[PDB]
Design a binder for this molecule. Structure first.
Ligand SMILES: O=C(O)[C@@H]1CS[C@H]2CS[C@H](CS)N21
Ligand SMILES: O=C(O)[C@@H]1CS[C@H]2CS[C@H](CS)N21
Ligand SMILES: [Zn+2]
Ligand SMILES: [Zn+2]
Length: 230
C-alpha cells in the first residue's frame, strides 16, 4: 500500500501505530534477532472506553514505548492483553504490562510453553481454546485456535466490526518466500491449520501477518506455498 511503516523506518526502541479501521490499529516495533533487525506487528482494539491489546512489542523497553505511544495517540487505557503464542515477540513485555495495570491472558498451552522457554508468562488462562477449530469471544474480538502451524499454541484474532483477521506469526507477509523459524512449527499440519482459518473467516478483508506488511486472504495461500516449498 506504501502507507504501512517498514523496518528501516523504526529504530529499535520506537513503536509506530497504524490505523486500520474505526477502533482498530496495528502496532509496529523492531528488534535485533540473529544478527539483523526485524519488524513485528500486534493489534489494538477499542472496547467502549478501554483498549484490548493483542501481543507485546517484543521486549520490555519496546512495550514501555508502546504504552507511551498508545497514551499519546489514542488516550484510552489498555486494560487487557492477549498473547497469541509463547515467543518473545508476543510475550516479551508481559511483566511491563503487569506493572502498568494490564491484565494479561494466554491459552494454557502458551503459558506452559512460555514457562518452559524461560519467557514471561501471561497471568490469566483463556478458556475454551484447547482443540483445533475452537473459537471464543473476548470483548470486541473473536479468538480462534486453528491447530498447530508456526507453533503448536498459535491463536488468530478476528475483529468482526471491521472484518480484520490478525493471523499473527502463522501467516507470512507476501514478500517472504522462505520459512522463518521452524523449531516450534508443525510443517505437516500448517497447511491444514490455514484451511481451518479460511473456513472460519472466509470474508476477512484485511489480513495482518505477525511480521511485515498487511494483505488480504491471498496471504493464506501464500503462506501455504512457502511452508510446502520448504
Ligand atoms: O522467543 C522464543 O521463545 C524463541 C526462542 S528461540 C527463537 C525462535 S522464534 C522466537 C523469536 S521470535 N524464539
Ligand atoms: O519465525 C518467524 O516466523 C518470524 C518471521 S521471520 C523470523 C525473523 S523475525 C521473527 C522472529 S521470531 N521471525
Ligand atoms: Zn513466533
Ligand atoms: Zn513472530
Amino acid at each position: 500500500s506504501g502507507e504501512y511503516p517498514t523496518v528501516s523506518e523504526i529504530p529499535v526502541g520506537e513503536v509506530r501505530l497504524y490505523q486500520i479501521a474505526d477502533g482498530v490499529w496495528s502496532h509496529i516495533a523492531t528488534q535485533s534477532f540473529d544478527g539483523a533487525v526485524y519488524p513485528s506487528n500486534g493489534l489494538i482494539v477499542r472496547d467502549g472506553d478501554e483498549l484490548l491489546l493483542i501481543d507485546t512489542a517484543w521486549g520490555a523497553k519496546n512495550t514501555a514505548a508502546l504504552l507511551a505511544e498508545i497514551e499519546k495517540q489514542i488516550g484510552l487505557p489498555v486494560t487487557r492483553a492477549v498473547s497469541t503464542h509463547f515467543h518473545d515477540d508476543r510475550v516479551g513485555g508481559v511483566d511491563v504490562l503487569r506493572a502498568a495495570g494490564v491484565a494479561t491472558y494466554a491459552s494454557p498451552s502458551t503459558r506452559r510453553l512460555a514457562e518452559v522457554e524461560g519467557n514471561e508468562i501471561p497471568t490469566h488462562s483463556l478458556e475454551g481454546l484447547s482443540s483445533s477449530g475452537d473459537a471464543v469471544r473476548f470483548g470486541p474480538v473473536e479468538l480462534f485456535y486453528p491447530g498447530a502451524a508456526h507453533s503448536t499454541d498459535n491463536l488468530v484474532v478476528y475483529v468482526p466490526s471491521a472484518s480484520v483477521l490478525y493471523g499473527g506469526c502463522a501467516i507470512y507477509e507476501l514478500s517472504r518466500t522462505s520459512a522463518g523459524n521452524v523449531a516450534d512449527a508443525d510443517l505437516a499440519e500448517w497447511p491444514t491449520s490455514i484451511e481451518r482459518i479460511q473456513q472460519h473467516y472466509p470474508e476477512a478483508q484485511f489480513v495482518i501477518p505477525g511480521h511485515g506488511l498487511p494483505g488480504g486472504l491471498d496471504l493464506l495461500k501464500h503462506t501455504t506455498n512457502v511452508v510446502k516449498a520448504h
